[PDB]
Amino acid sequence: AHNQFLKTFQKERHDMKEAEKDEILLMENSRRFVMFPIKYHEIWAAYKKVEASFWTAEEIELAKDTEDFQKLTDDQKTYIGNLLALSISSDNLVNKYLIENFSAQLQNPEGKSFYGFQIMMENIYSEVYSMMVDAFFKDPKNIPLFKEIANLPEVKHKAAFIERWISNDDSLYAERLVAFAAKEGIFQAGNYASMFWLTDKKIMPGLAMANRNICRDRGAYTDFSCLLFAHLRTKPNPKIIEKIITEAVEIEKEYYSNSLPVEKFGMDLKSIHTYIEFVADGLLQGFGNEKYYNAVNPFEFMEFFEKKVSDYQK
Amino acid sequence: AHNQFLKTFQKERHDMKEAEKDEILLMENSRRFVMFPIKYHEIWAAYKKVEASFWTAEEIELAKDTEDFQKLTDDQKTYIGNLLALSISSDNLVNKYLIENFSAQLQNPEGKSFYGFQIMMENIYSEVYSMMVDAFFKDPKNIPLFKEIANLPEVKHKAAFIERWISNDDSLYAERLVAFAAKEGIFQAGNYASMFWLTDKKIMPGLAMANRNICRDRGAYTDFSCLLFAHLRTKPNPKIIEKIITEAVEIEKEYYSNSLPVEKFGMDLKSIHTYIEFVADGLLQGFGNEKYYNAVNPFEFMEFFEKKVSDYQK
Ligand SMILES: [Hg+2]
Numbered sequence: 001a002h003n004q005f006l007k008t009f010q011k012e013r014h015d016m017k018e019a020e021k022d023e024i025l026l027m028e029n030s031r032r033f034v035m036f037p038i039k040y041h042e043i044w045a046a047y048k049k050v051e052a053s054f055w056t057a058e059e060i061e062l063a064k065d066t067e068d069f070q071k072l073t074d075d076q077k078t079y080i081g082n083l084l085a086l087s088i089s090s091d092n093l094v095n096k097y098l099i100e101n102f103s104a105q106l107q108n109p110e111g112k113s114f115y116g117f118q119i120m121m122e123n124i125y126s127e128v129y130s131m132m133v134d135a136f137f138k139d140p141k142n143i144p145l146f147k148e149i150a151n152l153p154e155v156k157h158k159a160a161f162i163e164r165w166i167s168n169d170d171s172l173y174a175e176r177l178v179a180f181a182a183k184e185g186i187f188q189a190g191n192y193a194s195m196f197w198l199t200d201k202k203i204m205p206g207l208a209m210a211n212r213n214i215c216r217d218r219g220a221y222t223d224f225s226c227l228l229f230a231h232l233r234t235k236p237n238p239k240i241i242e243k244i245i246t247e248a249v250e251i252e253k254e255y256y257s258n259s260l261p262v263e264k265f266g267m268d269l270k271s272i273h274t275y276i277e278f279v280a281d282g283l284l285q286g287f288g289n290e291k292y293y294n295a296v297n298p299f300e301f302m303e304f305f306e307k308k309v310s311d312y313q314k
Numbered sequence: 315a316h317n318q319f320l321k322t323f324q325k326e327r328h329d330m331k332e333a334e335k336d337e338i339l340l341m342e343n344s345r346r347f348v349m350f351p352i353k354y355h356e357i358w359a360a361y362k363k364v365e366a367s368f369w370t371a372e373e374i375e376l377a378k379d380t381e382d383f384q385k386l387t388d389d390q391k392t393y394i395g396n397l398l399a400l401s402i403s404s405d406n407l408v409n410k411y412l413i414e415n416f417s418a419q420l421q422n423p424e425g426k427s428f429y430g431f432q433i434m435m436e437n438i439y440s441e442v443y444s445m446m447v448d449a450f451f452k453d454p455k456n457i458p459l460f461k462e463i464a465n466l467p468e469v470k471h472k473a474a475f476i477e478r479w480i481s482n483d484d485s486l487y488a489e490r491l492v493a494f495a496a497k498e499g500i501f502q503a504g505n506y507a508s509m510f511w512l513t514d515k516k517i518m519p520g521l522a523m524a525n526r527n528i529c530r531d532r533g534a535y536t537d538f539s540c541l542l543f544a545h546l547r548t549k550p551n552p553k554i555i556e557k558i559i560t561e562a563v564e565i566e567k568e569y570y571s572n573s574l575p576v577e578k579f580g581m582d583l584k585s586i587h588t589y590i591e592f593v594a595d596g597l598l599q600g601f602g603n604e605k606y607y608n609a610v611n612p613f614e615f616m617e618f619f620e621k622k623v624s625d626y627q628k
């Protein structure tokens with residue numbers, strides 16, 4: 001099964017565990033909390049970075065945002081409700097647990113300093129969701145999908161991905177790190193694409209903000225998993241790097257063809273299908289891996305000086 | 315020794331452990347992270363409260379604040395340096411570890427949500443200190459006391475207090491909770507009193523802010539240890555409640571008669587000695603315990619509508 005693939009590398013992934021001991025990033029030493037005089041500049045750079053963007057639930061004003069809602073189709077309506085629930089009970093949850101695991105794995109303070117920020121926010125995002133559910137659904141009862149999540153091809157197929165690549169005894173840091181990057185960046189690439197499209201221009205402001213933010217932050221987060229990935233000596237055969245993102249890509253889509261609409265919501269599915277591919281490649285690259293899908297951005301998207309600066313460094 | 319005192323209660327502190335099982339606040343259940351629909355309103359009230367006051371190191375501009383420094387006595391000068399070090403290596407450290415312990419002990423999410431905020435800040439305060447040390451001391455080398463801290467009557471006498479009341483197998487939640495409140499509220503009541511007095515009016519702004527904040531926050535923090543204390547069924551014999559704050563009061567003082575000046579700094583020690591007493595009583599009361607020292611505020615201090623509201627509720 002999943003092993004048959006990993007069996008194909010029982011010689012370059014053996015040398016890896018055997019080398020993990022010498023992976024100083026995991027060289028569990030004293031530094032539990034950030035003694036100052038910092039050595040890891042980047043890892044810290046990133047902490048301060050996301051730290052700058054801090055925000056609260058109060059930053060989300062829900063009313064005059066309830067309007068545009070009750071004045072819509074009957075599904076975009078339920079689409080949202082499923083969206084706002086596939087989170088508050090699915091992702092947001094496993095989300096917080098995972099961050100502690102990885103945080104624990106990371107032996108450098110400055111690092112667990114970033115993670116320490118992240119969880120705090122995942123807690124704060126949770127409230128934004130329980131803010132929109134009350135906002136335009138009055139009660140936890142009023143949501144359909146909110147009861148048989150555990151029994152959704154997609155959520156089920158998702159969990160297997162984590163238990164398969166992360167929470168698994170037979171795993172390697174670099175690997176779990178990749179997937180985790182996959183889980184944060186790829187999984188839910190639609191949700192954003194969706195709400196983006198929607199809110200875009202003259203629809204439900206608060207929601208547009210929440211999504212603008214959340215999506216942002218989660219972008220930094222994923223970055224961290226890379227910023228960490230780039231520190232490891234013995235990297236995962238590019239092959240393995242692929243399957244991971246590959247697997248995530250496919251699992252991601254399923255949600256829009258099964259659980260949540262995108263068809264009934266109001267868009268040309270084949271596009272979301274492609275965008276997901278987009279994200280993944282850019283992510284494939286960010287781990288020292290050649291593009292796969294070779295997709296092309298289907299929607300005018302936003303997540304200059306620097307980019308054009310380095311573009312002329314290459 | 316310390317036990318002879320606790321031996322005097324080997325019948326009302328036996329019934330306590332025996333009752334801890336039934337202390338629902340420690341009734342370790344599933345809720346690891348805040349499922350929304352919140353039950354503990356206060357505990358959450360407090361989270362959101364401190365959450366409102368969030369801040370960063372960037373909020374502390376050090377320059378034009380370096381001036382007033384180099385234009386002072388030779389000790390206030392070193393007094394500060396010892397101050398800024400007795401933290402960055404003594405309190406700030408044990409500070410972060412303790413918060414995880416207690417956080418772990420607290421079985422309710424909303425609760426470990428607050429603690430989750432606190433540590434994050436203790437990390438951010440650490441930088442404010444390593445901001446002032448570079449600000450007006452150029453190097454870790456340039457600080458005297460910064461080498462034999464482990465060998466200071468006070469720090470040593472302090473640690474014993476924690477190992478004696480908190481990190482100790484033979485302890486009771488309510489008790490550790492008290493001390494922890496003592497450790498946050500009482501220990502360092504001087505430092506603030508000091509820097510307050512100093513900065514007060516026309517001296518080193520940044521520092522005045524940092525202290526204004528830090529002191530604030532830590533005030534909320536202590537409150538939490540009470541807000542938690544008030545939830546427990548079986549309370550600690552008022553007697554025990556006392557020794558704790560009593561012990562802390564005395565340990566606190568020692569610092570200003572031994573390590574750091576207050577005499578050479580520029581004040582009438584007998585005052586700080588009394589203020590410490592002040593804080594403690596107000597804290598003694600906040601645990602359902604009659605005033606002890608019966609001190610009276612010696613300095614015009616700040617940490618209305620509500621106060622005068624409840625004053626006419628009693
Ligand atoms: Hg995103």
Ligand SMILES: [Hg+2]
Binds near residue numbers: 223226227230286287
């Ligand atoms: Hg990277």
Ligand SMILES: [Hg+2]
Binds near residue numbers: 506528
């Ligand atoms: Hg204070």
Ligand SMILES: [Hg+2]
Binds near residue numbers: 537540601
């Ligand atoms: Hg209280």
